[PDB]
Amino acid sequence: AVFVPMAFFGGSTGAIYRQFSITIVSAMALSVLVALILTPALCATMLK
Amino acid sequence: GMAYLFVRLPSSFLPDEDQGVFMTMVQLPAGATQERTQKVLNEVTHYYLTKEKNNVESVFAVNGFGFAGRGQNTGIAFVSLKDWADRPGEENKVEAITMRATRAFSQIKDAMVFAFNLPAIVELGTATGFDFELIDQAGLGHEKLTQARNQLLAEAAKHPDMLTSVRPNGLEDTPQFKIDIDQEKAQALGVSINDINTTLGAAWGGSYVNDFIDRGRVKKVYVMSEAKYRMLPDDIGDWYVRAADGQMVPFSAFSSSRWEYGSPRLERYNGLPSMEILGQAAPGKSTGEAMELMEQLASKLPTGVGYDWTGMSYQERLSGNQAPSLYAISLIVVFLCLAALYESWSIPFSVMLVVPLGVIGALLAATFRGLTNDVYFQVGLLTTIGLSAKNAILIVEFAK
Amino acid sequence: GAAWGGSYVNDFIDRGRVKKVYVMSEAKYRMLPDDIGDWYVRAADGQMVP
Amino acid sequence: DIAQVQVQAKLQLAMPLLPQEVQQQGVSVEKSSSSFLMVVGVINTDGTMTQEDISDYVAANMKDAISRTSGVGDVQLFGSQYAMRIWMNPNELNKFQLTPVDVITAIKAQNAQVAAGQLGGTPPVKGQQLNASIIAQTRLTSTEEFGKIL
Amino acid sequence: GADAKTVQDTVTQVIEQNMNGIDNLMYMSSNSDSTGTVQITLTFESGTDADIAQVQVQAKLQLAMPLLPQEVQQQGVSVEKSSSSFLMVVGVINTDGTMTQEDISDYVAANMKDAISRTSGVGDVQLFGSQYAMRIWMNPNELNKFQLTP
Amino acid sequence: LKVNQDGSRVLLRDVAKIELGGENYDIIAEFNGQPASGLGIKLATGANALDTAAAIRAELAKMEPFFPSGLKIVYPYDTTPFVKISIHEVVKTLVEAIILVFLVMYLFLQNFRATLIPTIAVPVVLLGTFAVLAAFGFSINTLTMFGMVL
Amino acid sequence: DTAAAIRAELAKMEPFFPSGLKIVYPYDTTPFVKISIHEVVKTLVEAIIL
Ligand SMILES: N=C(N)NCCC[C@H](NC(=O)[C@@H](N)Cc1ccccc1)C(=O)Nc1ccc2ccccc2c1
Ligand SMILES: N=C(N)NCCC[C@H](NC(=O)[C@@H](N)Cc1ccccc1)C(=O)Nc1ccc2ccccc2c1
């Protein structure tokens, strides 16, 4: 809600404020996919 | 203190980096030669070699070609510095190297040589700096456009003013040798006007005649004259064109030698003639103010003279116009998403004022050191809104 | 061709810009079929021919 | 976009097989849509002029800028751009023994810009101090100067 | 050979009136030097296709190609993709079998320059010197001796 | 050229010097005060910067073996190693941020197997980001590598 | 949007006109677009209120 809306670029700063969001937005949604899947898995499998 | 540390914090676009490679352009006065500018390119090569052995690895000079355009006045030297390991301190990095090149050479010497770091950026995006241009929108010529351009440059530096630094792009203006060929004198003795035009054209300027073959490939064939017979204005009479009545006729018979004042570069913007002005903002002012206080000076000039902003800049800038709208929808979507998983009218406001909590710290580190509000800093802000939203949402989720 | 129909000769400059230069004839000498004989082309032996 | 490219890259193959009159004239491959939309009339009220003075100013200030702006297909000027117009009198040619061929040759000789070289040439002698461009023949400007062609 | 004023209306202006009816486009600029080298720059919108933009600019210049001098026609007209800034600058020197700054520039432009511009989508190559050419230096005194002209 | 009255032959050599030199003497480059030429390659407004610079060496490599005596290649002004340092300094930063996260996760949790889930969490998310950039059109830029650091 | 930028270029030309030169607008499709939006959005609000 702050990365992607700020990634509505304009002009010569097209891929400047765009790429410094969407790149890390894929990193955010894949860390949410890695926190909903796999991190729950290995915590139960082996920890103590 | 958060508003005070933001407005006073200045605005760049992207920091000018050490690239391990820079350059330095040359520019000689009216009607300089290839031999004159070669002396200037030699002295520039000395500073980088003998006086800078540790920092520079190799120079690549080029006589008669600047980034302004072309001609035997200009020059350029592509510097290629040693690797980053052999250059340790801040003295051995690009910023310090080109600093003692300018105010040193400038003042001394005779020509104008600068040196400058390569903009990572592009051609545009200097920040606190503009690119103006003045148009001839009526039937006045180039001579009258020169007077209006001198009146715009004058009044700009006449009252600074929270200053405005301004110079022309390169319309120096140098003299040209005009040759008036009287048409009645020519046909009287019996010389064709065709023959006279390709005598002067295929001798002084050169002429593309035909193609030949050299060692397998195919190249060109040119025709001109030995160097000494086309240097001075007195050597025009040395050429003799033949007439229909089988006898020689000198150039001095029908010609008339006389000097004039033209320009070696006629710029034209959008189907009309123009003159580029490369100006800039003050240390106080910044872009928006400098541009609107150059428009009321542009409308104070004679008739048939308007303006059009040429020409890399811009289409809605970044620190300004854009940023406001981007952060505005960032608040409208943050508010809605904090509600889809909460259901209240109080929980989302807690996260909507941790924005200034983390932001004051980011403004403190940049303003304390020699950093500024650029691209890397503005995205470091939005990341800290995601880190302050995270921690605070844990304080709001587990607690509810 | 360069009298009745017109002919593109060369380019010139008018008030900064660059325009065209045409060649034809005054209106009255190319309205009727009887005005063709008014034109006289020169021959190699230096004399006029209708 | 691509349809315009292939049509004008095939006409160009048969361009040399046309008359030399048509070559120097305006061949054009544009995008068409039989119908106008914005028709911008241009009149006069105060300082009165003709239906000829107006059409020149439309085609020497605002027409070149309109066709370029916001992807215009093709512009149709309602009149004609100015041009040095010559009206050859046939009776005044026979008086001085002349033809239209001699009038055309006089304009393609005196009315022309020639490419003269430059003092202090591209390969000069080592030690030359000055360097300027040579001007020779210049294209004519006004109605008065066209009247003084010999 | 042409000076600044000569190229300003014989090559420059001719193309600028015929530089219209193109998709997209913000502005146009130009530089007409005294050396005899004009160069236009049609800067289009951001995110525009550079492939199709090159086609329309060189399929409009070509309409006004016949209205130029015959000297400029046989010379190198070129519509390339520009990016004011070099990247790979490949110097070429000699150590053992010594030659001049002229012999080297020929071998660069007759072996490796034609291959470089073609390879991996290069915009435009700038040769640092000149390719060889059968150069003739006409002595004016030895023409008048045998009664002759250029 | 001619044959004067008495059967004497006038030749082009007799009236003019003939040297095989450059086509354009307006520019002549040096390299540390040594006579030289070169190749100033400029980008094609959308080219693949570094991959184009890698294929500049590809074509140049086949040219090297057939060089005259003394002809050697040198490299001033080159952007290639700045790309290789930005990848070597961001991936160095990447590995440094993982190893220091390990020390903070060992101080709080003394279990060695506990400091292992977050160590094998972020490496998976970083690789997944490369897959999304390839499917959207973005590349390994200065911005989408500093983005991996942030 | 093309017809809106016809006025954009024309607007910078207006100030440098000779004496008497004035622009008029016959045959124009612009206001038909502005009426179709003003009559459909009027219909939209009327269908909600009824
Ligand atoms: N094409 C030309 N000649 N110049 C364009 C350069 C753009 C701009 N700097 C300037 O425009 C300055 N020349 C303005 C100025 C500053 C101080 C005093 C006078 C003029 C710039 O970006 N860098 C500098 C900084 C300072 C300079 C001082 C003198 C000459 C050139 C300079 C260039
Ligand atoms: N606007 C941006 N950034 N990209 C539009 C791409 C259009 C489309 N892909 C899409 O339309 C999707 N990105 C849209 C989408 C699909 C599903 C969910 C959300 C968004 C797509 O064609 N993707 C790409 C990607 C890279 C390319 C590189 C070279 C040539 C073609 C390419 C095509």
What's E20's domain CATH number?
Answer: 3.30.70.1430
What CA–CA distances, in Å, run from B353 to B330, B339, D71?
14, 16, 48
Q: Measured between alpha carbons, how far is E129 from E92 in angstroms, rounded to an integer?
A: 11
- For every residue of chain C, which 3-state class applies, written as one string? CCCCCCEEEEEEEECCEEEEEEECCCHHHHCCHHHHCCCCEECCCCCEEC
Cβ–Cβ < 8 Å for B177, B184: no
CB proximity under 8 Å: B 85-144 to G = 137-138
DSSP B17-34: P--S--EEEEE--TT--H
**Backbone torsion region of residue D123, taken as left when φ is above 0, otherwise alpha when ψ lies between -120 and 50, otherwise beta:** beta
Domain that holds residue B157: 124-173+271-319
Rounded CA Rg of chain E: 20
- Token pair 């010097």 is at which residue? F17
Q: What angle do CA B298, B303, B304 make, to 5 degrees?
A: 85
Rounded (10°) CA dihedral F70, F76, F82, F84: 0
**B241 φ/ψ angles, rounded to the nearest 5 degrees:** -85, 140
Interface test with G, best of B136, B137, B145, B301 (most G CBs within 10 A): B137
The strand pair at D83-86 and C17-23 is best described as: parallel
In sign, the C-alpha dihedral spanning B236, B237, B240, B241 is positive
Angle at B304 between CA G20 and CA B261, to 5 degrees: 140
Which one, of D57, G8, E7, lies nearest residue B268 by Cα?
A: E7
B311: amino acid identity, one letter: G
Structure tokens at B236: 């025009």
Mutate to test the pocket of ligand 2, among F136, F138, F139 (most ligand atoms within 8 A of CB): F136
d(CA E130, CA B249): 36
- Tokens coding B180: 């008036």
Nearest to D44 by CA among D27, D34, D56: D56
- DSSP secondary structure letter of residue F23: S
For residues E139 and B203, what is the distance between their CA atoms, to the nearest angstrom? 10
The answer to whether B128 touches B55, Cβ cutoff 8 Å, is no
**Contact check, Cβ <8 Å, D21/C8:** yes
> Does C36 contact chain D (CB < 8 Å)?
no
Degrees to nearest 5, angle at CA E130 with B209 and B204: 45
The DSSP code for E138 is: E
Cβ contact B306:G12 at 8 Å: yes
Cis peptide upstream of residue B314 (ω within 30 degrees of 0) = yes
Smallest CA separation from ligand 2 atom 7, residue: F136
CB atoms near residue E76 (< 10 Å): 5
In sequence order, what are the residues at sequence separation of 6 or more whose Cβ sits closer than 8 angstroms to the Cβ of residue F19?
E135, E137
Atom of ligand 1 at shortest range from CA of B116: 23
Q: How far is Cα B132 from Cα B119, in angstroms, rounded to an integer?
A: 20
Length of chain G measured in residues: 50
E138 neighbors B223 (Cβ within 8 angstroms): yes
**Dist CA C25 CA C42 (whole Å):** 18
Q: How far apart are CA D67 and CA D69, in angstroms?
A: 6
CB atoms < 10 A from the CB of B30, how many?
13
Q: Which residue's CA is the closest to the ligand 1 atom numbered 19?
A: B165
- Residues in D touching G27 (Cβ below 8 Å): 36, 39
- Decide if A1 and B337 are in contact by the 8 Å CB cutoff: yes
Terminal-residue alpha carbon distance, chain D: 50
CA distances to C17, C23, D42 from D51, in Å? 20, 21, 10
- The two three-digit tokens of residue B169, written as one number: 């792009």
For residue B255, give how far its alpha carbon lies from the nearest alpha carbon of chain D (Å): 10
- List the structure tokens of B230: 């086309």
- Which candidate, B58, B44, B56, E111, places its Cα nearest to that of F74? B58
Which are the contacts of B332, defined by CB distance < 8 A and separation ≥ 6?
A5
Q: Are residues B149 and B63 in the same domain?
A: no
Instruction: Tell me the one-letter amino acid at B368.
Output: F
Of B316, B330, B332, the CB nearest to A10: B316
Q: Using a 6 Å cutoff on CB, does residue B165 contact ligand 1? A: yes
Instruction: Look at residues F54, F44, F49 and name the one whose alpha carbon lies nearest to residue F141.
Output: F49
d(CA E104, CA E118): 21
Structural method: X-ray
Contact F143, A23 (CB under 8 A): yes
Question: Helices (H) and strands (E) in chain G — how many of each?
Answer: 2, 1
Selection from B97, B37, B85, B83 nearest residue B61 by Cα: B37
Report DSSP letters for B108-170, one per residue.
SSSSEE--BPPPSS-SS--SS---EEEEE-SS--HHHHHHHHHHHHHHHTTS-SS---EEESS
* Residue E70 to chain D, least CA–CA distance (Å): 11
The token duo for F46 is 């959308």
Peptide bond into B161 cis (omega under 30): yes
- State whether residue E31 sits within 8 Å of chain B by CB: yes
Distances (CA, A) of B342 to A2, B140, B207, E34: 19, 70, 82, 73
Q: Do B201 and B61 have their domain in common?
A: no
The 8-class DSSP code of residue E111 comes to I
Whether the CB-CB separation of B56 and B23 falls below 8 Å is answered with no
- Please check whether residue B279 is in contact with residue B166, taking contact to mean a CB–CB distance below 8 angstroms: yes
* Residue in B130, B136, B138 with CA at minimum distance from that of residue B148: B136
Rounded to an integer, what distance in angstroms lies between the CA atom of residue D139 and that of residue F111?
A: 91
DSSP string, A1-48: --STTTT--BTTBHHHHTHHHHHHHHHHHHHHHHHHTTHHHHHHHS--
Strand ranges (E), B308-381: none
Q: Residues B117, B26: one domain?
A: yes
CATH number assigned to the domain comprising residue B206 = 3.30.2090.10
Nearest CA in chain D to F26: D122
Residues B158 and B300 in one domain: yes
Asked if B302 and B157 sit in the same domain, the reply is yes
Distance from CA of A7 to the nearest CA of B (A): 8
E16 is in which domain, residue-wise?
A: 1-82
Atom of ligand 2 nearest to the CA of F135: 25
Question: F15-54 in b/e burial notation, b at 16+ Cβ within 10 A?
Answer: bbeeeebbbbbbbbbbbbeebbbbbbbbbbbebebbebbe
| Ligand 2 atom at minimal distance to the Cα of residue A22 | 3
CA–centroid distance, A19 to ligand 2, in Å, is: 14
Which among B238, A16, C47 is positioned nearest to D98, based on CA atoms?
Answer: C47
For residue F60, give the nearest of E91, B361, D104 by alpha carbon. E91
Residues B117 and B146 in one domain: no
Q: Is the CB of B278 under 6 A from ligand 1?
A: yes
Residue of D18, D139, D144, D146 to mutate for C, most C C-beta atoms under 10 A: D139
- Choosing among B28, B72, B236, which should be mutated to test the D contact, i.e. which has the most D CBs within 10 A? B72
Closest-CA residue of chain B to D128: B33
Amino acid A48 reads K
The first and second tokens of residue B4, run together, are 């005070």
CB-based contacts of E22, cutoff 8 Å, min separation 6 = D68, D71, E42, E56, E57, E60
What length is written for chain B? 400
| Six-digit token string for B154 | 């004058």
Length, in residues, of chain C:
50
CA distances from E125 to B71, B220, E79, F44 (A): 19, 19, 12, 10
SS (H, E, C) E11-63: HHHHHHHCCCCCCCCCEEEEEEECCCCEEEEEECCCCCCHHHHHHHHCCCCHH
φ and ψ of B210, to 5 deg: -155, 175
Q: Which candidate from B225, B227, B274 shows the least CB-CB separation from E140?
A: B225
Please work out whether the CB of residue B167 comes within 6 Å of at least one atom of ligand 1.
yes
Q: Compute CA E16 distance to the chain's CA centroid, rounded to the nearest angstrom.
A: 18
Specify the DSSP class assigned to residue B11: B
**Is there a cis peptide before residue B311, judged by omega within 30 degrees of 0?**
yes
Give the span between the Cα atoms of B36 and B72, in whole angstroms: 9
Could you say which of E4, E22, E28 has the minimum Cβ distance to residue D133? E4
Residue in B67, B164, B167, B287 to alter for ligand 1 test, most ligand atoms within 8 A of Cβ:
B167
**Taking CB atoms and a 6 Å cutoff, what residues make up the pocket around ligand 2?**
F 136-137
Please name the residue of chain G whose CA is at the shortest distance from the CA of residue D39. Answer: G27
Tokens of B149: 């351009």
Regarding whether B41 and B112 lie in a shared domain, the answer is yes
Per the CB < 8 Å rule, is B214 touching F26? no
Query: B71 with E33: CB under 8 angstroms?
Result: yes
Q: Which residue of G has its CA nearest to B140?
A: G16
Which residues from chain B sit within 8 angstroms of residue C16, using beta carbons? 136, 139-141, 273
Could B49 and F78 be called an inter-chain contact, meaning their C-beta atoms sit closer than 8 Å? no
Closest residue to F63, CB basis, from E96, E112, E126:
E112
3-state secondary structure of B213: strand
Return d(Cα D88, Cα D108) in angstroms, integer: 16
Q: In what order do the strands lie in the sheet with B257-261?
A: B257-261, B175-179, D132-135, D118-119
Give the separation between CA F27 and CA F44, rounded to whole angstroms.
24
Q: Cα–Cα distance between B333 and B338 in angstroms, integer?
A: 8
Q: Are strands B257-261 and E86-89 parallel, antiparallel or unpaired?
A: unpaired
Give the start-end residues of each E strand in chain D: 41-44, 83-86, 118-119, 132-135
Ligand 2 nearest-atom number relative to CA F136:
25
| CB distance B121 to B14 below 8 Å | yes
Alpha-carbon distances of D74 from D28, D68, D130, F98, rounded to whole Å: 9, 10, 49, 62
Backbone angles phi, psi at B166, to 5 degrees: -145, 130
Report chain B residues whose CB lies below 8 A from the CB of D135.
Answer: 176-179, 260, 262
Place of tokens 């001007």: D135
B70 in the same domain as B27: yes
* φ, ψ of residue B85 in degrees (nearest 5): -70, -40
